[PDB]
Design a protein around this ligand. Structure first.
Ligand SMILES: CCc1cc(C(N)=O)ccc1-n1nc(C(C)C)c2c(-n3cnc(-c4cnn(C)c4)c3)ccnc21
Length: 214
C-alpha cells in the first residue's frame, strides 16, 4: 500500500537549496517539466513504431496544463510512457543520486539552477514554485501509483485507488507556494510556454476554467 523511503542526504541538500533559493527566473520550472513530458512522449512513440499495441492504453500523444485555482494546484499531464513503481522507488533513485552529485559539483563551480535540466533532475526545479508535489503515473504492464514528497527527506509511493485512471502516462500536481500563484493564470502560462518551449513536437493544451458572465 504506502511505502515510505528516505532521500539521500545530498538529495535533500539539493531539494532544500531549490525551495529556499531566491533565483529570479523561477518560470524555468515549467520548461523543465514540459521537457520531461516531451521526453516521456518521445519514448512511447518510438517504442510503438515496432509495437503499435503499446498505444492502445491512450492513442493520443499530448501535454496538458490544468490550473486548479480552488486547490491552488498547477497540474501537468502527458500521455508519455509513464513510470513503474520500480522506476519510482529505485531506478530514478539512482538517476537522481548521480544527477544530483553532478549538479552540485556544477553549482559549486558557479553554474546555474536553470542548467538543472542537463543533469537529469529537472523535475526537482518544481520546488522553485511549489512546496509539495504529487506524481500520478501509469506505465503499461504496471499499475497506477502516486509518488509524493514535500522537499523534505521523505517521499511516499502509494498504490493509486482514488484518482481518475490515466490510461497511460504521468500527471504532476504542483501545490504552488503562496507567492507563486501567477502560474495559475492563463495569460502567464501562455507567456512562459511560448518563451521557453518553442520546439516541442507534441500538442501543449491549456485547460482554462472561466465563469460565464450571465
Ligand atoms: C525523468 C522521470 C520523470 C518523468 C516525468 C514525465 N514522464 O513527464 C516527470 C517527472 C519525472 N521525474 N524525474 C525524477 C527525478 C529522478 C529527477 C522523478 C522522481 N524522483 C525524484 N526523486 C526520486 C528518488 C530519490 N531517491 N529515490 C530512492 C527516489 C524519484 C519521481 C517521479 N518522477 C520523476
Amino acid at each position: 500500500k504506502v511505502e515510505t523511503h528516505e532521500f539521500t542526504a545530498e538529495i535533500s541538500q539539493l531539494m532544500s537549496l531549490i525551495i529556499n533559493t531566491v533565483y529570479s527566473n523561477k518560470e524555468i520550472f515549467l520548461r523543465e517539466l514540459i521537457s520531461n513530458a516531451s521526453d516521456a512522449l518521445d519514448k512511447i512513440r518510438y517504442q510503438a513504431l515496432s509495437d503499435p499495441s503499446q498505444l492502445e492504453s491512450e492513442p493520443e500523444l499530448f501535454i496538458r496544463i490544468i490550473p486548479q485555482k480552488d486547490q491552488k494546484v498547477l497540474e501537468i499531464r502527458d500521455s508519455g510512457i509513464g513510470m513503474t513503481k520500480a522506476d519510482l522507488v529505485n531506478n530514478l533513485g539512482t538517476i537522481a543520486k548521480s544527477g544530483t552529485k553532478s549538479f552540485m559539483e556544477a553549482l559549486s563551480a558557479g553554474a546555474d539552477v536553470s542548467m538543472i535540466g542537463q543533469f537529469g533532475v529537472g523535475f526537482y526545479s518544481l520546488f522553485l514554485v511549489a512546496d509539495h508535489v504529487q506524481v500520478i503515473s501509469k506505465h503499461n504492464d504496471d499499475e497506477q501509483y502516486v509518488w509524493e514528497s514535500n522537499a523534505g527527506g521523505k517521499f511516499t509511493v502509494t498504490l493509486d485507488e482514488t484518482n481518475e485512471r490515466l490510461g497511460r502516462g504521468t500527471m504532476l500536481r504542483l501545490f504552488l507556494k503562496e507567492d507563486q500563484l501567477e502560474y495559475l493564470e492563463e495569460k502567464r502560462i501562455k507567456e512562459v510556454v511560448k518563451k521557453h518551449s518553442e520546439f516541442v513536437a507534441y500538442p501543449i493544451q491549456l485547460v482554462v476554467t472561466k465563469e460565464v458572465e450571465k
